[PDB]
């Protein structure tokens, strides 16, 4: 597995007007765009062929991941060995392919939109609005890539949440295979806490097998009138293998205002000042 | 009446890379509002509806944010979430935006001289958006300074009392006191070693300038760091013209620095976005 | 109530038109960027302004506003791909970037050429200024550029100047037409101006070509102008007001003009510049 | 079967400076339609709806041309949404465009290898948009070649008979003749000296390639002008595989040269614009 897909064509509503001309995934956490954390995360797991589904402010994605000749000459007097090491590696070690999602019909349609970039290969999906950090060990995506070579199924990252906060996520339920691994049998997107079948909510880290594409084409609109992955993975869990995995590490919900501030404050004390 | 405001936004922003690789430091958002948007709403509150932006590395993010977005109108179509956009929309309908490039980074003074085609022979305000200035209790810092200009009709410089140890990070002025908050600038030095700054009154990024400053910038030689400093050009004006330093009403976060940027983020989330 | 008639230093370029005649190509590019063989229409125009001594260029941008900006800004990528010398081609554009200052402002809604010129008011101020419509490709290889001729005439008589040329009476509905007293063979004092009149109602056969010298009171006159032909605000109608209680001169310029706002003139200009300029 | 088409558009295009400064040579307009739009309509006509563009110096104008324009729609309200827009809306309606950047201009072969993430392990067509090919009497050149591929399932290269004096401008092929217009290639040379030109038959910018060409390009050393030539890579394929040359039916204009660009403009003006 060497491919990673990044959906970045949402409405990004909780951060207007800042997200007017840049996607929610480009917001900087102190000094690093959300999506740059995620791309560095995928390279750690060996996924060096990056594919980005773009929408409004698509141009902020591209310009960030180009060889900037303006920036190149402005910083002639180095000190890029102090600030650009991370972004430069990405440009020299990764390939970036971009494709446009014309109409916002949900995450599932966004994942289906990137099919020509993936083909008949297993691929990872990273939702950058979920900032995942594991400074102690390997990042969440590497945890899931190592898990794929062993089980060779779809893997979805999850973590327990409060039951009142359950209608904000997709939630899975199933029998346990290991200390932190589950056989999924049911998946619902943003259910009513009364109908919440579990307290095990997905973060947006997914490892998908190419047969998911033909399943998304069979998925009908669900929560919010959008085509949810969650429903496409559900169909895959019945006739196939889909594992839920409680990752090791810290996650911030940077799709929310509150979570973004937590991430900004966290990364300043533990990442910037150092 | 003073009606133009200039925004230098062609800095290196070396402290906020890589995020500033393709967007200027002045476009960083506190919670969900770019720094420069606060400043333009500040300028419009003072009656300055003719905005001119001097652009540099990430020129497209400045233009794209203050441009009408026909895509945005289609995605948030039919009233929908205008609750997040009223501020920016008002700017687009009531303000005019003009852009000009600074291709060589030679200092804040040179950047202001670069905006001369956008200004001409009339007084204008200069705003450094990396200084987030807020006055919840009343008029904005720029509105305060515009009212002072209509009165004295000379160049006005925003200042604030600063600890003596941090005097090497700002421009410092000194002069005789005309009022508890207004000083007639005698002396101006950029970033002074702390037992050489003539006072502990530091310049904040808000100016009102008279057109004669342009020809004074052309006579200014490179100073601190080899850059052309508006502080040095403003010194020449003090000698045989009027320059007033004003201790403004309000709070200023140093969002040009990483620590001040977070102070502003946390403050605005608790008092403004959560509201 | 005092009109400044001082030295001219600024030139304004309206480039926010819909450009429907070349619509596929202009989807993301202004009609004024269509290359005549290898040089964009507007580059010809800005070189015209530099020859006249006007190094302060303001561009009113629209749909493909980004094609304009990228062509006149310092492209660091372009310099990297050479810096070793195929700058025979880049002599003209590098000159413009080194000797001119460019400022841009957007026209939000298309209400006409007059509204477009008013849109550039923040770039101009209370100054006399020239206006160039880049879809009118003007060449004078045996002498001065059209705008250079017009600047010389302004410096002497200090009025608003409108470049004109005689055209057949049947094509009069494509242009604005003037009529007035003839001071000398190539100079007229304008009395009346109508935009795209029907051939029966045309004041003369003297058609306005996109080269203007304007005094800054035209701005206040554009704001008083009511929508005209097609519901747009025409500069012709504001200049009509100025011609009444002021001085507006029509100038029969020397040189060849191509109508590159029409497909036919675009093809004609392409072949002319290819044979007489490109293999040279 | 085959559904993908690749468009290299990251050349230097210096013959068209300064017009190409911020736009690729493949975006130049022929009277009113960009050169690369003709080519994509050609690819759609052949059933190739998955478009991949390898971009470079003017990569922005490309993206913009094939992306949805909310501004252009708002500016029209169902009016001239026929006119010249008919062709380009169908393209955005029926195709999927993916873009990847060519960081280093090392040749046409390197440009095709750069697009490997967009193609994968499946056959694809390559189109050089500077070759304007028009066949008003039937199928498009690419359509002809896709039909030929469905039978032989080799790599197919479009060729054209040219005078021996022009062989240093093209890649030239030589091989045993299968039919009056189909040849089994065993030799391929890029821009040979007319004296050593192996034949009269010159390569036009239309290809059908099998995915093993990718690994062939990585093994290819710098050729003509020190650049990586697909001609040299296709040579390797012809020796250890099957490569067919096809005298296509239709008229081709060399819009990579100024003279041929004028020819295309005049031709398309008389025969297509009025129509
Ligand atoms: O049409 C669309 C909609 C969304 N996105 C992107 O998809 C991601 C997630 O979209 P978002 O609006 O944040 O959805 P959520 O409310 O977060 O829900 C999703 O993300 C959760 C984890 O963050 C999962 O638990 C849920 O199952 C999943 O539905 C973001 O990158 C969006 O930009 C697109 O690219 N296209
Ligand atoms: O060539 C340049 C350099 C800077 N800038 C911009 O202008 C401002 C410069 O500020 P900065 O680079 O942070 O310098 P400072 O340390 O801010 O110093 C200036 O701003 C302080 C207010 O914050 C004052 O105290 C000082 O007198 C004054 O020199 C920023 O918005 C830059 O983006 C330009 O546009 N062009
Ligand atoms: O709302 C608008 C309309 C036009 N333009 C620009 O201004 C010029 C207008 O040209 P065009 O649309 O071709 O107008 P014309 O029909 O050619 O008419 C103008 O040009 C003729 C000379 O070329 C004159 O005779 C007319 O009086 C004058 O109105 C072009 O550069 C446009 O891009 C704008 O910027 N904004
Ligand atoms: O590093 C590069 C070089 C070129 N190109 C593109 O490749 C195409 C062809 O480049 P060009 O320089 O025009 O090549 P030619 O000299 O025309 O030669 C090519 O096209 C000829 C016919 O047009 C063939 O006969 C040759 O074999 C083939 O190499 C154009 O789209 C270029 O932009 C790239 O994308 N990257
Ligand atoms: Mg989310
Ligand atoms: Mg500062
Ligand atoms: Mg015209
Ligand atoms: Mg070629």
Author numbering:
A (entry chain H): 2 to 275
B (entry chain F), D (entry chain A): 1 to 275
C (entry chain B): -5 to 78, 80 to 275
Task: Share the article's original sentences.
The enzyme uridine diphosphate (UDP)-glucose pyrophosphorylase (UGP, EC 2.7.7.9) occupies a key position in UDP-sugar metabolism as it converts glucose-1-phosphate (Glc-1-P) and uridine triphosphate (UTP) to inorganic pyrophosphate (PPi) and UDP-glucose (UDP-Glc); the latter, in turn, can be converted into UDP-glucuronic acid, UDP-galactose, and UDP-galacturonic acid. In the search for new treatment options, P. aeruginosa uridine diphosphate-glucose pyrophosphorylase (PaUGP) has been proposed as a novel drug target because it is required for the biosynthesis of important virulence factors and linked to pathogenicity in animal models. To establish a basis for the development of selective PaUGP inhibitors, we solved the product-bound crystal structure of tetrameric PaUGP and conducted a comprehensive structure-function analysis, identifying key residues at two different molecular interfaces that are essential for tetramer integrity and catalytic activity and demonstrating that tetramerization is pivotal for PaUGP function. Importantly, we show that part of the PaUGP oligomerization interface is uniquely conserved across bacterial UGPs but does not exist in the human enzyme, therefore representing an allosteric site that may be targeted to selectively inhibit bacterial UGPs.
The crystals have the symmetry of monoclinic space group P1211 and diffracted to 2.9 Å resolution. The crystal structure comprises residues 1–279 of PaUGP, of which we were able to successfully model residues 1–275; the C-terminal residues were not modeled due to weak electron density. Each PaUGP subunit contains one UDP-Glc molecule and one Mg2+ ion in the active site. The crystals of PaUGP contain eight molecules per asymmetric unit; however, through analysis of crystal contacts, it was possible to reassemble the biologically active homotetramer as seen in HpUGP. Each PaUGP subunit contains an open twisted central β-sheet surrounded by α-helices on both sides with a total of 12 α-helices and 12 β-strands, resembling the Rossman-fold characteristic for nucleotide-binding enzymes. Using symmetry-related objects, we reconstructed the biologically active PaUGP homotetramer as seen in HpUGP, which can be described as a dimer of dimers, with subunits A/B as well as C/D forming “tight” dimers, and A/C as well as B/D forming “loose” dimers, respectively. Subunits A and B, as an example of the tight dimer, are packed with a burial of 2,005 Å2 of solvent-accessible surface. As in HpUGP, subunits A and C, as an example of the loose dimer, are less densely packed with a total buried accessible surface of 1,054 Å2; however, a tight hydrogen bond (H-bond) network is established between four charged amino acids.
